[PDB]
């Protein structure tokens, strides 16, 4: 019972400094993300119908991104001052994981088609899309089911939960949202690129560059967040020490890098759909017919 070091570590200034940055990026992601993902769905549905299995996954990817960014104006209203905590958190993670699920499904569908010559009809792709959405919900369960509304604030009662829960929650998020998806799309697109590069395709050059971009963009937008989660998990795991100042730097880093990763769903329209000439020409026709 020495003159106790039980002094609270305050984060009041960090939150006040991070709020304007977070609010800004939220508005940016919602603006371009809703427009870009609408144009995706609009291009593959309006004039021409769904042709291949890729079109099915593109729409589902754009739909997942739409559901994600549409929660941001709700969170912005939350930061500024019915706002359902559990439900809004649910749509936040379900749309996030589904976005990562279909992205993974893009590579797989194009993997089995190129090297193993296994093609999927539209009818089957719709069935798999259902499975992924279901899988995205059951994997989001431990992220929103603990979230409730107390004193008009969305909170997670860590006292009524085990100490291992925030650790498991981080580990699942790290391997589930980064490691596994990045590992799959890298292996798939490496195999694909290595076949096309030696083929006699007259577009073999651009195909590889497109697939490389998918991997590069994913890393430069998600890696800073998960690498910050790793050192945060290390703190919880008591593997490293943590002073008051360290927890403040880690707090700010988690907030900033998280908002950075939200920009990736705005780039998805540029990574898959509007990178193809057919969708480029189609949009050019649509924008001309509506003007």
């Amino acid at each position: 019972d020495y003159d106790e070091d039980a002094t609270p570590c305050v984060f009041t200034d960090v939150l006040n400094q991070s709020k304007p940055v977070t609010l800004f990026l939220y508005g940016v992601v919602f603006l371009f993300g809703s427009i870009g993902n609408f144009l995706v769905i609009f291009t593959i549905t309006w004039r021409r119908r769904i042709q291949c299995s890729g079109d099915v996954y593109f729409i589902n990817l754009a739909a997942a991104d739409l559901l994600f960014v549409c929660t941001l104006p709700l969170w912005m209203q939350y930061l500024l001052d019915s706002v359902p905590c559990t439900l809004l958190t649910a749509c936040f993670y379900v749309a996030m994981f589904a976005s990562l699920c279909f992205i993974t499904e893009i590579a797989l569908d194009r993997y089995y088609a190129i090297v193993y010559m296994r093609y999927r009809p539209v009818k089957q792709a719709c069935l798999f899309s259902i499975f992924w959405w279901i899988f995205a919900v059951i994997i989001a369960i431990p992220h929103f089911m603990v979230v409730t509304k107390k004193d008009n604030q969305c909170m997670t009662d860590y006292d009524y939960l085990e100490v291992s829960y925030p650790i498991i929650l981080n580990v699942e998020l790290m391997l589930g949202a980064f490691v596994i998806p990045l590992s799959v799309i890298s292996y798939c697109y490496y195999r694909i690129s290595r076949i096309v590069a030696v083929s006699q395709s007259r577009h073999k050059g651009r195909i590889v560059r497109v697939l490389i971009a998918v991997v590069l963009v994913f890393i430069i937008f998600w890696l800073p967040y998960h690498l910050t989660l790793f050192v945060d998990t290390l703190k919880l795991l008591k593997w490293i020490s943590s002073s008051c100042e360290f927890e403040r730097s880690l707090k700010r880093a988690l907030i900033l890098t998280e908002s950075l990763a939200f920009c990736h769903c705005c780039l998805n329209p540029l990574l898959y759909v509007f990178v193809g000439t057919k969708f480029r020409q189609e949009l050019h026709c649509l924008l001309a017919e509506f003007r």
Partner: nanobody, 116 residues
Framework: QVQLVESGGGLVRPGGSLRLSCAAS????????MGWYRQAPGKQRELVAR???????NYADSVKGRFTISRDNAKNAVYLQMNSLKPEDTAVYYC????????????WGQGTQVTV
């Protein structure tokens, strides 16, 4: 370079049948769909039959019920059985192939003549 070789055209009496054949000469693994196009004198180029390697088929309004399109994966070949031919079907039939990821369809055949 990959070229689409066409064969199976010719002349036939009204009500007869023909079988168009198209395949890729080179080695390409990124083709996911192929189809047939035609162009009558004084008219524009129109789609008549398209099939993907997944199985989903697409026919034109005027043609549906008479022509049957089929394909062969690994060989990148597409065949078109044209039963119950009409004099209005007289045009130059072109073969087309579509490519994944890059989403390009600049793969065309020389064009075969079909006169009924």
């Amino acid at each position: 370079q990959v070229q689409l070789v066409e064969s199976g055209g010719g002349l036939v009496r009204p009500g007869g049948s023909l079988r168009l054949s198209c395949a890729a000469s080179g080695s390409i693994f990124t083709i996911y769909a192929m189809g047939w196009y035609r162009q009558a004198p004084g008219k524009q180029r129109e789609l008549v039959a398209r099939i993907t390697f997944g199985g989903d088929t697409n026919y034109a309004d005027s043609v549906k019920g008479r022509f049957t399109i089929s394909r062969d994966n690994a060989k990148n070949a597409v065949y078109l059985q044209m039963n119950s031919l009409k004099p209005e079907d007289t045009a130059v039939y072109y073969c087309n192939a579509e490519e994944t990821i890059v989403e390009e369809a600049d793969y065309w055949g020389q064009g075969t003549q079909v006169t009924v």
